């Protein structure tokens, strides 16, 4: 939904380039190499993930564990507060 | 079923996946070559070779599972069962070629076309290409075939990509 | 003595300026006739057809050239100054171009490439993926929004919210336009 | 005021001629030359400077209105209120809609409408309204099929135009 | 050995290869200039010069081996032996020109036409069209190849000059 | 000389070449205007004006030396010497017009059409020239309306050709 | 002797940056609409050939252009002209087909480093505010953009001096040397 | 098929600095315009193949290039040549396809330190006049720029001698050795 | 969120610049010089080594051998704890 | 080879700053000053020397000759055991 999209955009807008390539490597298996080659922003990678419907408001645990692996507890807390 | 769903599917695909779909559909419609996706879908609908199951299988192969639920109102389980209980629309050779082409970036297609510059032309590869176009060009020259894959395997080994060689070995062992 | 001047004016407009004028002349030129236009001469002739641009009457061309912020052609060929153009445009009864197009064009100017990608990445629900194409200009996005009656004169909510999500500066332009209106 | 018809018709365009023929379709083999309309209207007595001015104002060629008829938009607009029955407003609405679709939109429309239409081909939007009238499904009172087909290609402002015209009358 | 394989050949080939096929068949049809490929093949069939061997050779020149394997059910070695034994239809000059035009990219044909503008009068103008135009003025012929060789040598492309000299040494 | 030669010549030409030849033969076709080039050749043959030298002249004026060598067994030098000795059927004014029209671009000719539409009441330069001649504005003796028009479009190169022709004829 | 061969050899020695500099220097004699599709020196040479400014008999413009971008190698390898001859020819008044304004602007563009470039771009916001803040804009493009909005002109040089004085001082020397002519 | 594999594997073992050195060493056989898009050894190999100087049976130029930049493991691993075998071939006249001027310039380039580079820039700044004051440019770019302005010519070496003598002494030794060779 | 991928990420996150340079020199035999030129973090080197199939989740002797040289006992402990 | 590279790393790991400067001064003759300028560790110097083919897996006498100037007999015995 629109709140989900704006939340995704907000969380993507606050990622560093080092964290960006870290996330790009972290999702090597799910997405092919060619698609990851042309990714320049976190929002684009999020849309690519959503294309396979593994990431969605009905099941967002993957994003939770991704943020946990990123060691960014603030973003995880914001995501948890989103549905509340 | 109708033309409305075909139009909706056509307008929901970017230019990248259109080429993938065209390459995937070459085996089914080999009499003529369609320029765009709309013409190809219209031809298969008119010939009666296109149905709900065929479109579901194509969307499963192109890895766009969301459109299956959004348009066809089906999940991955339904298309998986349909593939299990029905004959394949596309030969496994085509899906293997697509899987290989998915993992090759722009920095490796240049190496491939440089290594295989002797077999094919030089002015044809000057324009920006992708692995699917190189496969098409090789298939035109009768170098790569569903039952003949030694040359492609050797070429992939020469660029030091062992995993794709293992994938070719797995496919050949399957058949 | 007159057509030569028009040709000279039309010989110094590149593709970007041509697209800007084409967008600015959407109300007075239907969409169907706009596609064949490929140079400034065709647009000038088409405007001549609708009797709103003649030798005697040159106000529309003057303000059109002033809108895209190209005063060199105004001062050299048309022989006019910026101050008198501003004074004329201050009068509410001499503005052929509505404030909607001017506001959208200013928003288009204020947006860079990264912000353009940000816009393109936050509206997948509205516009089809095929229509995005990842290379369309911002004006094309605006006209596509106008086609689906999503962004009208009275309907500025979605543009305002995507602006607030992207940039604070564009909100200033939007709200001052609203205050003026 | 009698031989000016050749001057008027010589300054028009092919698509302009097609639009003019579509507008005159309300009034048999379609005459490519306007002289048949000239004779028919002169025998009927309907032919007048006002009718030609109204037609030119409809087709948006004000330069020929000033050059030939020596009249501006205000004069023809005032004369319009006298008796705006030369062309039905349905034709005007159809022409206005046809002036707002590019090649891609008309291609999508013909592809969608090919579902229940026989394979007759390159044509414009105004070349399909005639086909639908031949099939007799776009009536001046009911346009449900046209609106349904138009809503699918994501053009809602024209749908609102249809709704406004329908509610107006 | 029928009349429908011609239609399949027309359908399979794209316009890019169809232009090369037209150029290759230009010399044999010295009095007719068909715009399409289907009518040219029909003319060849009616004249009687077209045959199964001729069609196989023509499709082999265009480098479309899948059509040979599919339609004619012939291999490359069989058609190579046929060419070695049965004298060829299209001259070596035409195939040499096609090979030369294959390797010239878009950035070099513009330089070539700029150089040669003094002898004649990014638009897509392929080398085949330029060589046809040069043939019109009677400058490039299987006997006279000095101009083309000199021009190719003057734009830093020497392997094509080597190809031309090899062809000259062949005859 | 014979019907089959001219038939082959007409068959081997191109549509642009046919149109250029039809324009170039306007001066001799003042009495009758053949819509088709074959009709023009037949008219020339029936009046005796279609000779070997004349056919060589027309083929040389369209730059088709391959047909000159393949059919007439003549080269450029022989036909040039014949031109030097024998009188020219077509005035060099038409040759100049054809040469100018062969070099202008489609955008350039469109701009020229826009500029010159004020005097007159898709179209190639040859069409513009013949239409202007129908309106009697440009003639083999007056060329200011062409020289100034060409200078106005920043193509000053062809003004040199026009002035060289004007000086040469006088 | 082949004029076309010499022109091609001259054009083969110029990269994209020198091509852009050549395009900017000759902006007066070719309009911007014709200047959009120029992607290599051959097209520019043809465009100059159209306007009777470059031919076999008259080479007085190509030599000046190659001298202004300090490509003195080509002036002696191909056109067979020494530096002193060109300097003497340009010294004589009336033979300078390019106004001093363009060459002055080009010299200012050449005499600015990357840090000075970004400082100039940052300081330009005082008057023209900001159209778009992408750093990819070269100094020549920025100069053209400022010239379009009559911010900077032949008689209007106050903005350039004001911005330059905040960065360097030799630019003021160049501007004063140019002003000495008037 | 073997030759293409050998060329690709050789090109896979060349970094950016070696690519720049190879590009500089072959300015004579590659024009300036065609050299800008080169970003890897493969494009350079293709360009050399086009000129017909690197063929299956003609490998002299590749050996010379790989020996000049002092990479001998590649020479012994793929082309199967030792140092002495290549040295004897290069010693005899007539087989050297690289001008002694270019190799002398490269040898001078290798033996210059960073502080010496800064002093080198400072010494000859009188002529360039602060156009290349940025310190991120290596010595090869400076040499190319000096070659453009006909300062450091084949027969014009006074500037180089003066600057090198002002900076150091071994550079003058190398220059004198090169002069003694001629 | 593959366990092998997250373990490789965690291992690469704890390296230093000198250790990365030493690892780059050590793996010079397999990976070419040009590819090793552009690496900046151990994550890229691990991703590149994943291609040659010498480093795979099935057999991780190469990682243990590499970490033995660096004398980082904690990372070896993490590696052997991952297997169990 | 892998044992050769690991031995070279091991012998380079025990060097010091003064030893590095002495080795650079001794080896200044082989290569230019620029090539020896930014070298900061013995590992970088060994990588540089591997180019000139003077240090090869087959014959390592130059390595022990260079190390003999440092009076480090332990490294000499280590390389002797390696080549055994």
């Amino acid at each position: 939904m629109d709140p989900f999209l704006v939340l995704l955009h907000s969380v993507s807008s606050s990622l560093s380039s080092s964290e960006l390539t870290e996330l790009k490597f972290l999702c090597l298996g799910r997405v092919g190499k060619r698609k990851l080659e042309r990714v320049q922003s976190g929002l684009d990678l999020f849309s690519m993930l959503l294309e396979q419907n593994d990431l969605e408001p009905g099941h967002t645990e993957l994003l939770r564990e991704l943020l946990a692996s990123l060691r960014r507890h603030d973003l995880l807390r914001r995501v948890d507060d989103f549905e509340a | 079923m109708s033309a409305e769903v075909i139009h909706q599917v056509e307008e929901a695909l970017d230019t990248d996946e259109k080429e993938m779909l065209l390459f995937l559909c070459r085996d089914v419609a080999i009499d003529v070559v369609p320029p765009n996706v709309r013409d190809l879908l219209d031809i298969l609908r008119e010939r009666g070779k296109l149905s709900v199951g065929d479109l579901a299988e194509l969307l499963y192969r192109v890895r766009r599972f969301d459109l299956l639920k959004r348009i066809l109102k089906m999940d991955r389980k339904a298309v998986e069962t349909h593939l299990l209980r029905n004959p394949h629309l596309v030969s496994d050779y085509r899906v293997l070629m697509a899987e290989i082409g998915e993992d090759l970036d722009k920095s490796d297609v240049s190496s491939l076309i440089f290594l295989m510059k002797d077999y094919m032309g030089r002015g044809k590869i000057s324009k920006e290409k992708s692995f699917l176009d190189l496969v098409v060009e090789l298939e035109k020259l009768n170098l790569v075939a569903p039952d003949q894959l030694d040359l492609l395997e050797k070429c992939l080994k020469n660029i030091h990509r062992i995993d794709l060689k293992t994938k070719i070995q797995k496919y050949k062992q399957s058949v | 003595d007159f057509s030569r001047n028009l040709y000279d004016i039309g010989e110094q407009l590149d593709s970007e300026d041509l697209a800007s004028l084409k967008f600015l002349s959407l109300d007075y030129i239907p969409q169907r006739k706009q596609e064949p236009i490929k140079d400034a001469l065709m647009l000038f002739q088409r405007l001549q057809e609708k009797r709103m641009l003649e030798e005697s009457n040159l106000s529309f061309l003057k303000e059109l050239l002033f809108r895209i912020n190209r005063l060199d052609l105004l001062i050299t060929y048309l022989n006019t100054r910026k101050e008198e153009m501003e004074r004329e445009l201050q009068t509410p009864g001499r503005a052929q171009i509505s404030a909607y197009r001017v506001m959208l064009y200013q928003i288009s100017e204020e947006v860079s490439r990264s912000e353009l990608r940000s816009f393109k990445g936050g509206l997948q629900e509205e516009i089809s993926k095929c229509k995005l194409d990842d290379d369309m200009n911002l004006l094309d996005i605006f006209i596509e929004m106008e086609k689906r009656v999503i962004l009208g004169e009275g309907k500025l909510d979605i543009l305002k919210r995507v602006c607030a999500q992207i940039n604070k500066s564009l909100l200033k332009i939007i709200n001052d336009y609203e205050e003026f209106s």
Side-chain angles (χ1 to χ4, degrees), chain A, chain B, chain C:
Chain A
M1 57 172 183
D2 187 74
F4 187 81
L5 191 60
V6 66
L7 160 72
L8 192 64
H9 193 188
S10 53
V11 71
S12 68
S13 60
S14 56
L15 286 200
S16 74
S17 308
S18 62
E19 292 179 353
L20 182 49
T21 179
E22 195 169 0
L23 208 69
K24 253 165 54 188
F25 169 85
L26 203 42
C27 191
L28 206 49
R30 264 77 184 281
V31 178
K33 193 147 162 33
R34 155 179 302 281
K35 299 189 169 193
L36 298 182
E37 175 70 29
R38 68 180 65 252
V39 169
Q40 294 88 18
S41 303
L43 162 66
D44 195 0
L45 172 62
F46 292 149
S47 56
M48 204 90 75
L49 262 170
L50 195 146
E51 282 185 22
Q52 284 92 18
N53 80 25
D54 44 37
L55 164 61
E56 54 181 359
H59 280 83
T60 186
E61 50 269 0
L62 164 62
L63 188 152
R64 296 171 191 169
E65 50 205 288
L66 212 57
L67 282 183
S69 298
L70 287 175
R71 306 188 301 255
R72 287 276 269 210
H73 51 282
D74 43 357
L75 315 175
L76 178 59
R77 175 174 53 201
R78 173 198 301 198
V79 162
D80 281 359
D81 300 327
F82 157 73
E83 76 260 7
Chain B
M1 168 156 49
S2 86
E4 192 262 331
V5 58
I6 278 181
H7 159 75
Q8 260 189 351
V9 159
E10 167 197 5
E11 54 89 21
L13 300 193
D14 58 356
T15 71
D16 187 78
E17 282 134 11
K18 286 183 188 177
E19 302 305 318
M20 185 64 72
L21 195 63
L22 264 293
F23 175 65
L24 275 173
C25 279
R26 268 189 61 192
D27 285 4
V28 174
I30 202 165
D31 43 354
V32 296
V33 296
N36 57 77
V37 177
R38 199 177 69 244
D39 302 336
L40 166 82
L41 292 192
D42 177 74
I43 294 299
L44 278 71
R45 189 167 68 83
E46 289 274 12
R47 209 206 283 184
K49 280 194 164 305
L50 180 59
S51 75
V52 59
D54 314 311
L55 205 63
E57 166 164 348
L58 276 187
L59 277 189
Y60 178 87
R61 286 322 179 175
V62 76
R63 287 184 83 79
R64 202 156 262 268
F65 301 155
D66 55 345
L67 281 193
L68 277 188
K69 181 154 197 162
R70 208 201 89 185
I71 310 292
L72 277 296
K73 308 175 273 275
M74 294 167 69
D75 55 351
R76 64 183 180 179
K77 300 287 99 175
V79 63
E80 179 181 8
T81 46
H82 180 85
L83 175 77
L84 281 171
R85 68 181 184 269
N86 294 113
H88 311 283
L89 180 61
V90 285
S91 303
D92 291 338
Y93 165 73
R94 299 293 184 187
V95 70
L96 160 71
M97 288 298 117
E99 180 162 346
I100 279 183
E102 263 291 334
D103 276 330
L104 293 190
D105 44 345
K106 288 160 155 159
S107 175
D108 278 334
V109 296
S110 290
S111 190
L112 264 294
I113 66 172
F114 177 78
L115 290 175
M116 279 192 275
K117 198 169 64 83
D118 61 307
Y119 293 119
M120 67 192 301
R122 197 262 164 197
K124 183 68 179 181
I125 59 174
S126 182
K127 165 183 151 292
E128 193 73 29
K129 296 314 204 277
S130 304
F131 185 68
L132 304 154
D133 207 7
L134 164 68
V135 175
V136 165
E137 271 285 331
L138 281 183
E139 194 161 356
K140 279 174 186 171
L141 303 194
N142 197 7
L143 284 196
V144 58
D147 70 321
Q148 167 194 356
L149 277 149
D150 294 339
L151 190 143
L152 182 54
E153 159 186 358
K154 161 160 85 166
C155 277
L156 285 175
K157 186 182 202 169
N158 267 321
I159 70 167
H160 280 310
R161 280 194 99 108
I162 308 303
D163 48 0
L164 302 190
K165 186 203 178 193
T166 64
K167 174 165 308 191
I168 299 299
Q169 264 168 359
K170 182 62 66 68
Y171 159 76
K172 207 198 281 187
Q173 212 169 90
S174 167
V175 160
Chain C
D1 59 339
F2 167 69
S3 305
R4 173 182 103 240
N5 185 23
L6 269 191
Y7 169 77
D8 287 330
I9 295 181
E11 203 65 20
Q12 305 202 15
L13 299 191
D14 46 350
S15 174
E16 170 74 19
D17 287 353
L18 188 68
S20 190
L21 269 71
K22 272 205 293 181
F23 173 73
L24 264 291
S25 283
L26 268 174
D27 46 1
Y28 304 119
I29 288 186
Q31 179 94 37
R32 189 209 194 198
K33 299 198 191 85
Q34 186 177 2
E35 285 315 307
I37 294 170
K38 291 181 180 180
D39 62 357
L41 294 164
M42 212 172 295
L43 186 136
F44 287 153
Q45 203 276 334
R46 201 83 53 221
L47 274 189
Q48 272 210 56
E49 269 316 296
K50 271 188 62 68
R51 190 178 182 271
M52 61 162 45
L53 170 56
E54 317 168 38
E55 173 191 7
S56 54
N57 172 35
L58 277 168
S59 172
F60 184 74
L61 178 70
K62 262 177 195 171
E63 82 178 9
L64 183 48
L65 276 182
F66 173 75
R67 275 313 177 194
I68 71 163
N69 288 319
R70 182 178 286 279
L71 318 181
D72 171 42
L73 299 195
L74 277 189
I75 183 61
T76 49
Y77 299 95
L78 293 193
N79 208 358
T80 195
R81 276 184 169 82
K82 164 200 164 196
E83 292 84 8
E84 66 180 1
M85 196 44 66
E86 272 186 345
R87 175 165 55 87
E88 167 174 316
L89 281 198
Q90 220 67 41
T91 307
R94 286 221 169 278
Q96 312 275 322
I97 299 183
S98 70
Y100 201 65
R101 300 288 157 188
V102 183
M103 183 268 269
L104 269 71
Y105 176 56
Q106 291 221 22
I107 296 309
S108 160
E109 290 183 353
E110 282 291 331
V111 161
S112 64
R113 278 92 170 183
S114 56
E115 288 188 347
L116 187 148
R117 184 168 289 176
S118 178
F119 278 106
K120 280 185 176 186
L123 58 83
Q124 289 77 251
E125 315 157 344
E126 317 296 325
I127 310 191
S128 309
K129 205 165 299 193
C130 191
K131 285 186 187 175
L132 298 191
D133 283 319
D134 266 9
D135 52 5
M136 275 200 161
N137 201 1
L138 200 52
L139 299 165
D140 298 335
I141 306 289
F142 280 148
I143 189 58
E144 179 51 49
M145 267 184 181
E146 274 191 351
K147 273 187 184 187
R148 326 162 77 85
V149 75
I150 300 170
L151 186 50
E153 183 170 1
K155 323 192 69 177
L156 287 154
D157 46 13
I158 186 166
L159 167 74
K160 189 163 302 191
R161 70 170 284 272
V162 70
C163 165
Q165 184 44 238
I166 293 179
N167 197 340
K168 186 183 193 58
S169 66
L170 297 173
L171 175 58
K172 165 184 286 191
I173 315 164
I174 295 186
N175 59 57
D176 67 50
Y177 153 73
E178 281 199 357
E179 276 310 301
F180 181 74
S181 69

